[PDB]
């Protein structure tokens, strides 16, 4: 059942002030994807600089996750694919062209310097966040260096080489009975969704733009297969969704499933390409709307890990990640940008808030009502 709910300003919940472990490494920001490439790890450095200059380090414990080894990566990936990934270099691709065409590397997954190091550091960040969330040493792991979900068991697509999300999920499943996964990225989490179709332990919900878009998968009928039936929900949307519409289509589904599924642990992707003015996105969310999902998920008092993917315009993703990091500490942000290295890149007004665009929303209320109708109908089975 879908009902229209106007958006309201975000206020933190002082009920809980759980520990926040913001994993970060200073060498991730050095790697580059190309010249005209939209995907830039430099946005992680932008967000970290914004956090540092903002005064948020006194609350959160900053770490530096150890890079993962090949044996750890073999927990989910194949030995051949990870071997090719480690061996491939931007120079010897001619000798590796057979694997490049076989493993789909080169078109949307360019080979660059330290690519295996990038994959290793992201996998290690997710692994250490899961390890901290499993030992009870923390309750929120902001692994902004991860957020790589498009990668599959033996393929790399969508600027996504190593699926660190499923590795962290397996680590959580080491001692947790059931785990749950959320998405906010405009695209679809094909690899993460596919990784746990036939089993009940993991659920994969994605709020993905559907139709003629990059993943092209994740319809409303992707119920599951075998014993994992009704345990993989999907919420396809359309172009131009706004903050209130996103909240109304997000919150009831999560409430219903955690009433039914009853997760023991939670992971939340935080794709920053679903904002206004985005380069590869088609939404109209704002930082308030983006932070609404993470605040709502955190308000349920469950062990959650926030990862960071997407984001192809520097200012939007940087501000959104800073706002999410602040709200994870139950602290509202100043919403004024302090001077730092990248002060010149933050618009002509130098304000943290970015105004969402005026573009025409497409999501009809009756279509959303029917969509959540099928979602609730299939979730009611279990």
């Amino acid at each position: 059942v879908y009902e229209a709910t106007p958006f309201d300003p975000i206020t933190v919940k002082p009920s809980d002030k759980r520990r926040v472990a913001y994993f970060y490494d200073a060498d991730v920001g050095n790697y580059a994807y190309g010249a005209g490439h939209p995907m830039k790890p430099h946005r992680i450095r932008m967000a970290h600089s914004l956090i540092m200059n903002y005064g948020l380090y006194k609350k959160m414990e900053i770490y530096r996750a150890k890079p993962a080894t090949k044996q750890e990566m073999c927990q989910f990936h194949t030995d051949e694919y990870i071997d090719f990934l480690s061996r491939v270099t931007p120079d010897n691709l001619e000798m590796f062209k057979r694997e490049s065409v076989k493993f789909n590397v080169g078109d949307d997954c360019p080979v660059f310097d330290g690519l295996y190091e990038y994959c290793s550091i992201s996998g290690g960040g997710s692994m250490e966040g899961a390890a901290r969330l499993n030992r009870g040493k923390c309750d929120v792991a902001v692994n902004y260096a991860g957020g790589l979900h498009h990668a599959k068991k033996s393929e790399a697509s969508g600027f996504c080489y190593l699926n660190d999300i499923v590795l962290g999920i397996i680590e959580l499943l080491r001692y947790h009975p059931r785990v749950l996964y959320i998405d906010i990225d405009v695209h679809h989490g094909d690899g993460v969704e596919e990784a746990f179709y036939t089993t009940d332990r993991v659920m994969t919900c994605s709020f993905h733009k559907y139709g003629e878009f990059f993943p092209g998968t994740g319809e409303l009928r992707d119920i599951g297969v075998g014993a994992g039936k009704n345990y993989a929900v999907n919420v396809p949307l359309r172009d131009g969704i706004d903050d209130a519409t996103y909240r109304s289509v997000f919150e009831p589904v999560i409430k219903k499933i955690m009433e039914w599924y009853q997760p023991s642990a939670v992971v939340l992707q935080c794709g920053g390409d679903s904002l206004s003015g985005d380069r590869l996105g088609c939404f109209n969310l704002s930082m308030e709307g983006h932070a609404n999902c993470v605040n709502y998920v955190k308000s349920f008092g469950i062990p959650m890990m926030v990862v960071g993917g997407g984001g192809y315009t520097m200012r939007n993703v940087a501000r959104t990640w800073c706002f999410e990091t602040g709200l994870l500490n139950n602290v509202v942000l100043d919403k004024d940008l302090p001077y730092n290295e990248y002060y010149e890149y933050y618009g002509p007004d130098y304000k943290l808030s970015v105004r969402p665009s005026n573009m025409f929303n497409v999501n009809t209320p009756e279509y959303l009502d029917k969509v959540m109708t099928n979602i609730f109908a299939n979730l009611e089975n279990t």
Binding site: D27, N30, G36, K40, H42, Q71, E72, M73, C74, Q75, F76, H77, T78, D79, E80, P90, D91, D113, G114, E117, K153, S154, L173, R174, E193, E194, A195, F196, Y197, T198, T199, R201, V202, P215, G216, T217, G218, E219, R221, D222, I223, V225, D239, G240, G277, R279, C282, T313, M314, R315, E344, Y345, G347, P348, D349, R355, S357, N358, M359, F360
Partner: protein, 503 residues
Amino acid sequence: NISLNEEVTFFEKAKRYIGNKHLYTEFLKILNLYSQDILDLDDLVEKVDFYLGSNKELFTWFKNFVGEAFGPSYKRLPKSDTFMPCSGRDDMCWEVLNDEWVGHPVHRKNQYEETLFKIEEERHEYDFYIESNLRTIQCLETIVNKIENMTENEKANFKLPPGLGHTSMTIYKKVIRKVYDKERGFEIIDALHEHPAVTAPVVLKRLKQKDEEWRRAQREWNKVWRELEQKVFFKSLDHLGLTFKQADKKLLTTKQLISEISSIKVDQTNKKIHWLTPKPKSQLDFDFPDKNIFYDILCLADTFITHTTAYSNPDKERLKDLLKYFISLFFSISLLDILHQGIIQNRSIFNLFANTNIYIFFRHWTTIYERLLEIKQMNERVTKEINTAYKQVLRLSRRLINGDLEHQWFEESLRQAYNNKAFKLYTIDKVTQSLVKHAHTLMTDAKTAEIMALFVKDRNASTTSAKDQIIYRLQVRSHMSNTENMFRIEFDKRTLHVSIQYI
């Protein structure tokens, strides 16, 4: 001028080879037609094959001179395809993961958003160049400080293996090739690898100078980047505010209005896709419920006539009354009156048959009108919401045509009044000027004058007949070219509704 005399000589040779004055003039006509960007290159070469095809060498010069499945999106992998060994998988990873099912696949951005993306990309490219230069400078500095302490004997046989002790051997190569030229980059890299003792200090000095030069260049470009962002970012919020602006710019062309009716006819009524019901008589439906939207628009018109640069006072005094005349004659509102079995008594349905000019004027009238009829249902709502307006928008639109208010503030004035409800009131001046110009071209033309006289005579009769309509059509067609597209307008007094139909 260096590469023109050769072409002059080639064309002289071609003219001499043709030898015929008339054929040469025809070839000149062909090349002039191509010069107007109307003839394709393939068409041009196929045409010149007829003339210069006899001479193979001249033709070659010309040619080289002008150029089991489960689920909707998931398919079960076969038994043989399920074996991709992974050594890191334990018992839980085997039990709780899947290896038998694999998924299979089955808006125009604003120009200013594109400009912002380009600006951001340029800034990031400069930043990446500067950061790579910094890393290479640090690497060369540590190499220089390591070699300076080293003795002369080790300096002589000092060889630099590829990599330079860096986390990425390709990081410094790009910086070196950027500082130098692409042809000398490989040579400089080889010299660094083979003669580090003499190469490292000078290359480090070059990098040190280029860092300062590039930083100064970036800070100089930042002025223009700041100005661009300041003057473009505010505009880069209204996706509907600019797309509809260009749509209104491109819409009111003479061909487009008749294109709408012809398209709707040929799509719905003429084609009869259903093939079950007869085609409807009319195409479009319009309503004129409010009459207070007439005096204000007439005042806007009189403002334009009193402010227009190119119009004569004897023409202006006529225009000041023509609009009153059409409103009084068409909507029955307030020869001397004119200057100021089918027989049905007391007719309420009237027909107006005219050419493209009257149709275009009526379409301009209706396009201006439906912009104001939509805000009728929202005036009270926005008046309620603003303090949690018709006079305000009227007086704000007054000051543009007379020149009191500049064009810019009009767009932002309505933004706060209507966030997304109103996005069609931003180009009132253009449609109003189009309407007044079309009224002028209606009055000036003699054929249009005869059409309006025939319409006056037809409307002055309170009773119509079957033969009277045919006589009216024949009379309007007598001075009318057959090739011109025929339209018809019917106005219903009972419901104050005006309908149109394409003939």
